[PDB]
């Protein structure tokens, strides 16, 4: 866009059903350098969520997973063999490098616009930034919806163009409890 008045107000419809992601994960500690990294995560995927209508059941339209090995006790035998019969849609992986790699690849494959998850800011998102700083996978910027000259350092601006949904905070909009940690 060039001139700030080529904006065209128009009031026909609601925007169409939009992709949403059922993202979650599970980190684990490391007494070695006193960090809490992660070796397994996943998400469910819905591919056109109605915004001005009722809820789409099934709760998804696809999903995936990814899992790496630790440095304290390594995998039990035949995980792919044991699971894919039961099939909660998990895929084997090798490195947390590979993990983030095919995570952003799953983005690339779907590219949603609303990231759903709880405990994000106080505990997790910054850890994702830490790990993308460490592993240094190419096309780092796909975590947002843009490419940037670099990944920046109150550090929420790093993620842009991608609705960072809430599950914890927004929960407290309506109902009261002792915990609102779900």
């Amino acid at each position: 866009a060039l001139k700030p008045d080529l904006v065209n107000v128009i009031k026909d419809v609601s925007p169409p059903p939009l992709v949403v992601m059922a993202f979650s994960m599970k980190t684990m500690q490391n007494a070695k350098n006193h960090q809490n990294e992660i070796i397994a995560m996943a998400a469910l995927v819905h591919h056109s969520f109605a915004l001005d209508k009722a809820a789409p059941k099934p709760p998804f339209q696809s999903h995936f997973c990814v899992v790496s090995k630790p440095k304290d006790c390594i995998f039990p035998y035949a995980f792919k063999e044991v699971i894919e019969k039961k099939n909660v849609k998990v895929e084997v992986a090798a490195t947390e490098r590979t993990l983030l790699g095919f995570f952003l690849a799953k983005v690339h494959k779907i590219d949603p616009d609303i990231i759903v998850g709880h405990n994000i800011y106080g505990f997790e998102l910054e850890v994702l930034l830490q790990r993308i700083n460490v592993c240094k996978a190419p096309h780092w910027s796909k975590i947002g919806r843009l490419k940037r000259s670099n990944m920046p350092k109150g550090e929420r601006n790093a993620t842009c163009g991608r609705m960072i949904c809430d599950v914890e905070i927004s929960a407290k909009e309506l109902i009261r409890c002792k915990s609102y940690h779900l």
Partner: protein
């Protein structure tokens, strides 16, 4: 310099907090000025980086301490005023005790826990740098001695006699004699013995 007396037998709680605070704040600020560091952290936003904190050290439990129960508390403002446990095992060399305000540096993983990395050093202020027309004086003798003023079974002040003897002997500029000129834990008193008033 405390001419008169107080007017106090009772306190008011939140103003204590106020005074603790003002202490912590002013000290921290005057230190940070010299110490050219950027900014500290609200103490409950865990983030695995170098992070510099301000606070004062205290006991978690009733009485004394260890090397594994130091706890920290922050000012009213800089970090919203809350507490966080600590430890320093990884660190190397320190010296702490309650009431003491200090800067520290560690790594906050879980939020409700931390482990130290470093302890920057305190600083003294420059002493009085006086004039150069007044104090151009000569030698000078001052003697001083604290209390109590007897062996704790009599009322004689024999040592006071010996003292005043030395005094009259040596002609000093000024002497100063700390109390306490009559202890209470002095056994001769706390059985309610002395056949006299006190003043």
């Amino acid at each position: 310099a405390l001419t008169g007396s107080y007017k106090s037998m009772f306190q008011k709680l939140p103003d204590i907090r106020e005074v603790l605070t003002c202490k912590i704040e002013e000290l921290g600020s005057e230190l940070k000025e010299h110490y050219k560091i950027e900014a500290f952290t609200p103490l409950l936003a865990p983030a695995q980086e170098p992070v510099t904190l301000l606070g004062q050290i205290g006991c978690d439990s009733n009485g004394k301490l260890n090397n594994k129960s130091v706890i920290l508390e922050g000012d009213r403002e800089h970090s919203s005023g809350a507490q966080i446990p600590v430890d320093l095992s990884e660190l190397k060399e320190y010296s702490l005790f309650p009431g003491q305000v200090v800067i520290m540096e560690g790594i906050n993983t879980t939020g409700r826990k931390l482990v130290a990395t470093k302890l920057y050093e305190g600083v003294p202020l420059p002493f009085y740098q006086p004039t150069e027309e007044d104090a151009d004086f000569e030698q000078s003798m001052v003697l001083v001695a604290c209390g109590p003023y007897t062996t704790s079974d009599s009322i004689t002040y024999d040592p006071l006699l010996d003292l005043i003897a030395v005094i009259n002997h040596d002609r000093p500029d000024v002497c100063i004699l700390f109390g306490p000129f009559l202890d209470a834990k002095h056994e001769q008193v706390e059985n309610c013995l002395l056949t006299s008033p006190f003043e």
